[PDB]
Amino acid sequence: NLPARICRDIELFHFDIGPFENMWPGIFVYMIHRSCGTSCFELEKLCRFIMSVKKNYRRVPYHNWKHAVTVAHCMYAILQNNNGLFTDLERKGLLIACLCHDLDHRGFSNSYLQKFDHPLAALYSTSTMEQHHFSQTVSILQLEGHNIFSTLSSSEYEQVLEIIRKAIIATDLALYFGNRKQLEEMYQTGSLNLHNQSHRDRVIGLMMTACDLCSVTKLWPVTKLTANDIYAEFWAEGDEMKKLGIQPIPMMDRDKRDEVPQGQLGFYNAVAIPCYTTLTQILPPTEPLLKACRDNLNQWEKVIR
Ligand SMILES: COc1cc2ncnc(N3CCC[C@@H](c4ccccc4)C3)c2cc1OCCc1ccc2ccccc2n1
Ligand SMILES: [Mg+2]
Ligand SMILES: [Zn+2]
């Protein structure tokens, strides 16, 4: 069962899941049963599914099993503070999408895969690794005793898989810029309609981005340490770009590491702040994410001074 401190702290947007890996499944089970009912998901099947998902994450610095559960927690907190907006089915799908969205991630971007001429880039031209993460999710669901959705109708099964596919694909940050621009225009013209499936899919897309980027919404000591893991992958990809004979972008070039604070500023300005600002406009109870993001922007500004 869940320790008292976790029981309380799990409801905070800036919760950190801790360094004990064997506790994470229980944290995920608690979140999905609190969000979607103890009804649905036979415990045994869910646990089996969870353990296989874990097994298919890699021991990379950032896009690892810990990241999956952390992204799932952020989604939990959004859903807990916006009661009555999403269906039981959506809530289950979104939480599973979050757990699975980075399956088999090797710590390299779609861009590197393209430049490498990796076989995945020939299979899936755009959102290469995300299409792969979704395929891996379906493959795991298809394993004996792993169908956590087995009690759903055929129609609901197809429904939930589609929710998951769109949610995983939306974690391709390249898609975020256009998604956010459209949502913002709809907000400002007052035409956003959550009963319109296309608008709804967009809002879910932004939620997925907001959860994926959530390191910037933790408290500063957590944000700062997490940035170390983020750069560890970027710099490893930059080394690999150099090995292909391509000069990496500055963000991936360890020779430019002294410019991290300026790079962070750019990221918060162009990506993080607009993302959480748009999210708060649509879902006001997500305000704490924006506040924490702004606090971290200030800390980065403080580093530069
Ligand atoms: C939480 O941190 C980051 C988290 C990120 N999470 C996901 N993707 C990122 N990249 C993807 C490619 C585009 C990039 C981007 C887009 C617009 C504006 C800036 C960056 C975001 C992230 C960049 C981050 O920060 C990296 C920031 C950065 C940018 C340039 C740099 C240049 C030199 C040194 C460090 C640098 N660091
Ligand atoms: Mg990803
Ligand atoms: Zn991710």
Locate the domains of the chain by residue range.
1-305
Contact 41, 246 (CB under 8 A): no
First vs last Cα of the chain: how many Å apart? 46
Compute CA distances 17 → 73, 167, 212, 215, 259, whole Å.
Answer: 8, 22, 15, 12, 30
CB contact set of 108 (below 8 Å; sequence gap of 6+): 233, 236, 237, 240
Q: Is 102 annotated as a binding residue?
A: yes
Q: Measure the CA–CA gap between 46 and 39, rounded to whole angstroms.
A: 12
**CB burial string 184-212: b at 16+ within 10 A, e below:** bebeeeeebeeeeeebbebbbbbbbbbbb
Q: What count of Cα atoms within 13 Å lies in the side-chain half-sphere of residue 279?
A: 31
Which ligand lies nearest to the CA atom of residue 98 in the structure? 3
Closest residue CA from atom 24 of ligand 1: 267
Task: Answer yes or no: is the C-beta of 271 below 6 A from any ligand 1 atom.
Answer: yes
Q: Residue 63 Cα, ligand 2 centroid: separation in angstroms? A: 7
DSSP-based three-state secondary structure for 104: coil
CB contact set of 242 (below 8 Å; sequence gap of 6+): 248
Tokens of 141: 């669901």
Q: Residue 211 Cα, ligand 3 centroid: separation in angstroms? A: 8
Task: Answer yes or no: is the C-beta of 157 below 6 A from any ligand 1 atom.
Answer: no
Contact 145, 273 (CB under 8 A): no
Q: Measure the CA–CA gap between 185 and 192, rounded to whole angstroms.
A: 9
Q: Residue 273 Cα, ligand 2 centroid: separation in angstroms? A: 19
CB contact set of 73 (below 8 Å; sequence gap of 6+): 10, 15, 17, 27, 31
1-305 CATH, one of 1.20.1250.20, 1.10.1300.10, 3.40.250.10, 3.40.30.10: 1.10.1300.10
Q: Measure the CA–CA gap between 106 and 60, rounded to whole angstroms.
A: 7
Tokens of 107: 């710590």
Looking at the chain, which runs of residues are DSSP E strands? Answer: none
Identify how the structure was determined: X-ray
The residue whose CB lies within 8 Å of the most ligand 1 atoms, and thus the one to mutate among 267, 275, 300, 303, is 267
Tokens of 150: 């087995």
- What resolution does the deposited structure have, in angstroms? 1.8
